[PDB]
């Protein structure tokens, strides 16, 4: 009838938007369904013709994209059980506490060159804290490192920015120093420091952030499924949804007068990340710049 716009072979009609041969139609499908990633061994120039089209997949799929084949034109496996849930109830009545809030709570109860002293000293603490947070230890010892590497930064900040409740216009490093505001501007890090006071310390402060609620948030910042490397992201993404659940309920119990508290608690997260990124910025600027005043645990962390 027609000619396949991808390889030249005879096209058996239309498939996903273009005139494709039955072969190419199957290639596109499998690629999209099993979500595969191909790489070219030449210069992304490999020629596609009925003879040598299996010569290189990357090039072939791109020939597809270009000739107009649409990915969303593909439906998914008309043969799934699509239910990772166990019959009836997986923890009778949800248990709500598959991620017990008490455990976290307990786990929580367990100028510049001065800051980093706290950091290092505090970085050995994190393994302790995380170690105590349920389901973390049952995770692959690799993902544990990935999880803690990608989040030590944020976890550490959200810890002291709470510890600095009261103590206005200043903050207490984990060891004992009361680094006060004006004491930073001199060092040149007055911009960042102030942001911590105004969108963390402050906000956190006027909210009466329950020492629990904090730990519940640090858990969410820990169980970050997006971290690159997790041999399995689905599991991590889950343990976070569990914690969304626990904390979510924990406000229905403790703060019934505040329906929109759960959300207000989760919105402390965006700022915790900008501030967190801007800080790394001020570390890869104090390290490669040979000022090297840090210790040892800050070497693999960077």
């Amino acid at each position: 009838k027609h000619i396949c716009a991808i390889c030249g072979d005879r096209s058996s009609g239309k498939h996903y938007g273009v005139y494709s041969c039955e072969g190419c139609k199957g290639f596109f499908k499998r690629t999209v369904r099993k979500d595969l990633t191909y790489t070219c061994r030449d210069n992304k120039d490999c020629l596609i013709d009925k003879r040598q089209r299996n010569r290189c997949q990357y090039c072939r799929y791109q020939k597809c994209l270009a000739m107009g084949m649409k990915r969303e034109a593909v439906q998914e496996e008309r043969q799934r059980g699509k239910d990772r849930n166990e019959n009836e109830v997986e923890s009778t009545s949800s248990a709500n506490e598959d991620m017990p809030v008490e455990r976290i709570l307990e786990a929580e109860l367990a100028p510049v060159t001065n800051i980093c002293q706290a950091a290092d000293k505090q970085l050995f603490t994190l393994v302790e804290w995380a170690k105590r947070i349920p389901h973390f230890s049952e995770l692959p010892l690799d993902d544990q490192v990935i999880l803690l590497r990608a989040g030590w930064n944020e976890l550490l900040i959200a810890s002291f920015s709470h510890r600095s409740i009261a103590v206005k216009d200043g903050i207490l490093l984990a060891t004992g120093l009361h680094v006060h505001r004006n004491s930073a501007h001199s060092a040149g890090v007055g911009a960042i420091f102030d942001r911590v006071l105004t969108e963390l310390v402050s906000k956190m402060r006027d909210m009466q952030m329950d020492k629990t609620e904090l730990g519940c948030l640090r858990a969410i910042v820990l169980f970050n499924p997006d971290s690159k490397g997790l041999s399995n992201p689905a599991e991590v993404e889950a343990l976070r949804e569990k914690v969304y659940a626990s904390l979510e309920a924990y406000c229905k119990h403790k703060y019934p007068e505040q329906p929109g508290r759960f959300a207000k608690l989760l919105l402390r997260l965006p700022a915790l990340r900008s501030i967190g990124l801007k800080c790394l910025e001020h570390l890869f600027f104090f390290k490669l710049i040979g000022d090297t005043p840090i210790d040892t645990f800050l070497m693999e962390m960077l």
Partner: peptide, 9 residues
């Protein structure tokens, strides 16, 4: 190395 150690145990 460090993170791996503290985690090792």
């Amino acid at each position: 190395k460090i993170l791996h150690r503290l985690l090792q145990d």
